[model samples]
Target: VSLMEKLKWKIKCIENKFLNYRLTTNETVVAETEYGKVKGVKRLTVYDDSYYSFEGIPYAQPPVGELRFKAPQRPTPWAGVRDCCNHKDKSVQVDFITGKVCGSEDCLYLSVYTNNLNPETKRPVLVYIHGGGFIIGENHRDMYGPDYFIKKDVVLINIQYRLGALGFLSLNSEDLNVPGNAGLKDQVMALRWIKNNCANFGGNPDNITVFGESAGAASTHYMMLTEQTRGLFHRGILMSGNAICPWANTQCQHRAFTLAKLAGYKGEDNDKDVLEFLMKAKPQDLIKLEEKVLTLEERTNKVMFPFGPTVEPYQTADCVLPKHPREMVKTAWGNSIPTMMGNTSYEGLFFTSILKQMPLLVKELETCVNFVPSELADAERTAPETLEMGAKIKKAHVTGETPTADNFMDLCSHFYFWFPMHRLLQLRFNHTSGTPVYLYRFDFDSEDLINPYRIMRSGRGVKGVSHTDELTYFFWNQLAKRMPKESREYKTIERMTGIWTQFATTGNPYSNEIEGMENVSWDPIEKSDEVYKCLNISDELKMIDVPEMGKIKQWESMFEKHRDLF
Candidate 1:
């Protein structure tokens, strides 16, 4: 049968099963999905005269037992109601409570919410992908709760996919029969479900947007390149993660294999042997073994997440590894949706603080780079800057109109965070089609309260904008400095939320108007190497360009040398 015929049959079968489900709440409803008509609960609580909501819903079949490692299949029709009132089980992952690993394979679900549903008008959808470095996060995390976006009338959906070895493992070559990136495949299935059934939930399937912080952001980059995810979402917001370059994910694959071997998968054959061994081991035993080989604490210090998404040659069709996401954008091989991508002011501070505390020499760096496949060996060689490359980058940093310093701390920011991010944006815009890109450098620092005791000095201590520091403005939490109820920062919160909500609702990020607020005229990244917006907490929004900024060409050329592995 044709692909359309197969999809129609699947939808018909699910519709029949959906008829069996009963409504449990006034807001709760059963929706027909390719999997089946699953029950879901919706909360429309009023908070500050605006609606807050919660939608606990199932979008795919449970990935359990033999279903493990395989692409997600449609959910089977159930004769009776399945309790979806509570959140689905998180992926088999490291436990946050006990600091130990806990979970199962049967974990493929999503939750959604919106301010208020109008049957007359279709609402824009924002699908969130949780980050755990491809290992540890869950959909139930409070940070992903829809309370913030629901009040703004934007529908929010948080997805939960497999993590760690269970979610992303490229076993023996024979296992290629199933291919790899099952976790990513799970996400594709969820997006497909949204396309097929989002309307039933009072959402506009065609007006979908995908956003994620950290690894989730990185996954969004991957989805942009994957043919499987093309057209699933109209736009994307990549916050603080950019795995578009092949080196990022390849590095994780190398670390994964090394860790597995260290955990006693010492065999002489292909990846299949390792897969069988991992599968045969008990879940707890595997966790123990993996931990003994390497711990999350160490990985976090390195700022490297484990088992990141990989290039699935067969599934992706003819376009293979030789083309990194950067190259794909240049060639226009992937989706060319409007994108909002940026990094925090100090993206490296979070990871480098620890790495600098325990410095690595040239030898150590070389070893880490060598752990991956030979194809990536060259990219590894080119991706990171050497002392000479670092010097060239420094020249550019100093020339920029933005503030700079001669100190090592300043050097760290230039080499690791600022320079790399700027280069990334430049490369993407140069290649991709569609709307011009909107870029933001999150410079808002919440350091005053974070270090109220004043034990650490500005230069000697952790100062300047730190990685993830801007999250406080976006998410209401105590992890960073909290603003008073009626402060300027609070107003900024409202503005930021409005901008994001507007972006999700339509391709444009800003609404023509918002009362009592200045209409921010955000501009796209410019082609000339000279001027780009430098966002700070002041009225002086400087647009400066430096001569050395042209050095990005050197970095891009270097990445091209190792293109195939990407």
Candidate 2:
């Protein structure tokens, strides 16, 4: 599948270079957006089927020139029919595989995929927010993108926004006036565009469900937490992240200074000088120093995201994050919105290969409190409180009184994704009058067909499902091609997509439609349930009271006194 996918891209590159995506099609479909008429192309997707693909429809004006650090502006209306047959460039950032920078600064666009264009057909709209820790990401462009969801008879939209410093760098001083999260704002603009224009492409704006993984999952949760995106999306699928993850939201002024200095700024540290220098610097230079700016604490804690959404110092009419998530999670809650949120069984196994490369960090784990999540406000490494927290944490994993490969993955899985999400679930559930909250843990593992992401990150021999392992079933990536229908992996795909599409369509992750899943029920977490009731999705689906909750309770007690840090 990997070889074929790579070859398919090379062939498409050659084809697109000559044929411009297509020279002839079954028929050209056009949609009337407020800005203008957009000409779309009929293209075949994963299932040997076709959908009206409107690629690269601009939702906001490009954030270039004087608008580099400002909020996105409304897209300029076009005059004649705009050809949207090809995806535009993605946000500027360093390519992960290659060290070279790629994409463009003029990258505010979205693509819509649907089987119908008539407004009367009003189908559920699934809007995806791609995740790259708020530094790097693009609209979903997997070889067979959106085909799985298209089969569910839903409308799909993939969006692209500013990334890295170009997207999230924040400096609120009058001289610079960049209040951070220009990228999150870019998402808001895209959502509004969908809210205003979804029905034109046969999507029910009122039934829109925004879903994402990792940092994008945090963004999806932020959409619900913020004042800016209310009414734009009705439901959310926040996989492996939320507003409270320390890496997802924080202050980034020092980061801006660090990034500017690395980019050859020879001026004062004032916002004026820094902003002036960054403004004049090459676009590619802005996204390259994210790793360099991580503080010692951040590095030790594995808080790799140096910049992302942050609390605005001053709230205005359009402010997205007015208060810290730790504070706002209590006030700006998602009580009104039913939610489905959880993580993979071993979310941190995704980092096993990379974490092994840092021997020094591993060594420090035995000597200090470096493993504490950064969400805790500078829990001084040598402080007695930190030692006590680490003592309890180590006891929970029962790992020879120190971190090991066996325990590191599970420790990270709990601290980084599971615990934080669980914290949100309990607290948010306390607030939600009774809107259903369906919790889940995707723990399916197979020796025959390891998820490609898990295999790429930690290899096939790894034992548990890693972060994004569930995504293999949710999308038609190269790895999912030609999978046997009767295999468990294929069943995972059907279950994941079926439930997700069901969630988008009815705000419930259970379905009355399945080959034999009609009798299955994924019970929501009820007020009376003492356990963290959730669906355990593996080779066979069943309701379970979170197997780790008894041991993870020690973790709960460890963080009990440190609640204010979040």
Candidate 3:
């Protein structure tokens, strides 16, 4: 062979080995990131569009040993190409089905799926943070497959942060820097990492749309509250959760101390002593004990998120949610970014079993059920008037200490999930500098019944339009039974993905490409409108006023009546 041809082949090998990942490869592909060169694989989307997938990319060093409970540190640089073809460990969490401990502490990993790795052809970025009430959920391919989103000309990234006590446990220490919300800080770190290196994966870092479901949505919302996330992401999609949710951010110092004692740490008031003991304990032991440490009210049939976001005692970069969500929304770093946020028709209907639903509400009705959020009642959002507000909520929701299935479900949904989202919209509408905030009520239902089989983590049964149901439209869950291409269920998937992809490309969610939604424009919620108008997403996508304006008004009156107490 001629030396010129030999030199050309050598150069191509060098490029494949070191620099460009844009080129298609039959075997493996390598993309050079700021940290190091990482290897990946080429895969096909549901539509057979080819894309490169790099899974288990370490964004931060595993938060293990002394690093436990502390903020995540940037990943240590690698010496050679790191094979990221396979997934890594998920943040330690309990298997909802087996009820046994699962996952590992070495879990600070992320995945990137992109159709183009040519940095020059920068495409829109969609970074999805998975949700499991801040306790469970992984950015695994099974649950968040790129088959749907990959069809669009976009770069998709899924991230996993530390979960439960491993991620959110706060020691209330000024010297420790473990004042809780490290799970959130983990997310901020991931965003920062993505911003710095996404260009290598053919993504426009400035065009990133960070979105999530439930706890992940709250994480996305919390990212907006922190100073560290300034310019890290350009837009957000928060589904069924927000930083203002009663379960999202709460005082967990009580749980911290209680958990330490429950873990058999010598009951020391010194957070240093507690930290020392915790650092020594097995990671799973502390995580498992979080369930043991809950107060009766917390452990009851309420939305019982074991460890939640907290108001850090320190005001540092790690202090993600520094102030309460009420005030944080008013002064957050960037409130003007276009947002697409909403909850399902029945936000509270999916968490428990049918067998326990009626009976739990029935039992709690006999005594003080604590229907009002502890945040409002204790005035964390600041309100002594919440005493009256709490009483009013209980009075209106229950028929004199009796709760039917309808009122019981509505009360739980309103107090926990719906109210927070409502409060978020209200706060953002007033605070955002005329930013386009598109709201929606995901009422889409059919025989498909959004992961009807998956919700059986409690036990197989039917449910109303509830939490995480809408996710099936975007992500082809590994456990889900795939519908035929011609089925309405599959059609919903196309519509939802089209809406999401359109939003990432442009600020609006309307897509003319999909039939039935042709030329349908989804307008932003205008403040002048007496009621909040939103796109009702389902078989029929129409701009309609939000349901239960009366319930929102009921909450508005309570908060207005309670505001004076702060």
Each model's Cα RMSD: 10.5, 3.1, 9.4
Which scores greater on TM-score, model 2 or model 3?
2
Report, for every candidate in turn, its global Cα lDDT versus the true structure.
Answer: 0.55, 0.76, 0.75
Which portions of model 2 show Cα errors greater than 4 Å?
1-24, 373-379, 446-461, 478-480, 515-519, 562-566
lDDT of 3 by residue, 2-40 (tens): 355345445644543332233335668899898999999
**Residue 16 shift from truth in candidate 3, angstroms:** 31
Error of 3 at 434 (Å): 1.0
The numbered model that scores best in lDDT is 2
- Cα lDDT tens digits for candidate 2, 494-551: 7887888888888888876754455566788876766787788887777778876865
Residue 57 Cα positional deviation in candidate 3, in Å, after optimal superposition: 0.8
Query: lDDT tens digits, residues 321-391, model 1?
Result: 32455555565433367777666555545544344455542223222232222333333334453333333
**TM-score of candidate 3 relative to the true fold:** 0.89
Give the true-structure RMSD of model 3. 9.4
CA deviation > 4 Å runs, candidate 3: 1-26, 45-49, 300-303, 354-358, 363-369, 375-402, 447-453, 456-463, 564-566
Clashing pairs in 3: 142-478, 379-382
